[PDB]
């Protein structure tokens, strides 16, 4: 079962309030340097790492009472899921992945994202040629260093859902 980990105590603070849908977007994406939430050995350092946001950000605040965060991340994921944008969709898919990776390790979580809608949106998005081409060729930042493509990565993760 999940117990709040030591470390990264400043993250624990950032979510102890009512965070809007729109700010949870900035956070989960991390385009913006000031909403880029990662850990030392995250996979990529130049965009947000959802796992770190849930493990050290959203879940401790949630235990500590701030339950609004759930329905908000749900709306945040909804919008970014239906955005027609590669990184937006990529990182949404990465958030639901985070939950699964955390479930993996901790075996139980404080709450679970109800995702039928997000997952429907992801599914509609991925049957768009423009969107798939966007993803097939998205090479901004650290993505430039992988022959393996964003589309390849997202498709591999969906199979785990």
């Amino acid at each position: 079962m999940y117990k709040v980990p030591k470390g990264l105590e400043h993250y624990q603070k950032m979510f102890q309030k009512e965070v809007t849908v729109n700010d949870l977007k900035k956070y989960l994406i991390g385009s913006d340097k000031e909403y880029r939430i990662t850990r030392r050995d995250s996979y990529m350092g130049d965009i947000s790492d959802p796992e770190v946001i849930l493990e050290y950000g959203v879940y401790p605040a949630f235990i500590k009472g701030y339950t609004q965060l759930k329905a908000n991340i749900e709306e945040a994921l909804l919008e970014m899921s239906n955005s027609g944008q590669a990184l937006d969709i990529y990182q949404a898919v990465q958030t639901l992945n985070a939950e699964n990776m955390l479930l993996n390790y901790y075996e139980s979580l404080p709450f679970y994202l109800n995702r039928q809608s997000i997952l429907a949106n992801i599914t509609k998005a991925l049957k768009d040629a423009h969107i798939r081409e966007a993803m097939a060729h998205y090479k901004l930042g650290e993505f430039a260093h992988y022959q393996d493509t964003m589309l390849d990565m997202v498709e591999r993760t969906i199979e785990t859902f």
Binding site: K6, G7, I37, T38, D41, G45, Y146, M153
Partner: protein, 250 residues
Amino acid sequence: ERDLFEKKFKEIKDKWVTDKQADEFIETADKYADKAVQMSAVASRAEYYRMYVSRKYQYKKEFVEKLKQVYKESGASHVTSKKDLMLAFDDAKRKSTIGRQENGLFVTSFAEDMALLFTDQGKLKSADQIENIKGVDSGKYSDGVYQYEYDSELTKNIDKLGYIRTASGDTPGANSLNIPGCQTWSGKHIENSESELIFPSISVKDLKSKAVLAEIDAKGYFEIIDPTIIAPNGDHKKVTGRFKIKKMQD
């Protein structure tokens, strides 16, 4: 000059780095400068600082070659958490690789982890102590301190292909606390520093995370022999030697 270095660190400082880490980083900066000079990885402390600011880490071939000796003597190590180990097999974006696909895995020499992680009497240190030594968060090895190991021959035949890399500023998995000199930044206690190289990633395709840990709990290790590695150009290739995935014990 150093002033320029202090200005870059604030510019690129990652959200996860605490005021305490940031203070120690700037504070002890010139000891890491001078360690760099003493290893003869750099001519001057100024050169170290320029290199941090510029993000392009170039080294003299003579130095890199002398470093790889200790690596070649007893092989290579990468200390990791159970949690992160699992992530390598189960995180689908990683394509079943220990490391960042074609970008490699950070490592040190095996002799260094052995000497540094162990008591002279031969006992493994506290999780609490090792966490400190590695400059990681308290509790990240609570449920074990695991290790990736490339043995001496695997390393030897890797070097033969020309697949050992140095870390530089645009290297995937590098951050504000990454540092010129083929050396890790291990906080205020500089003598807990160790060498850093980049070895190629091991393919663990089709491998099951749960299997590996069960197999490690049953014996103390799990091994790949003639591992498929991933070269920079990204081709999959088998290389003669041994790669163990240990949980460390006395």
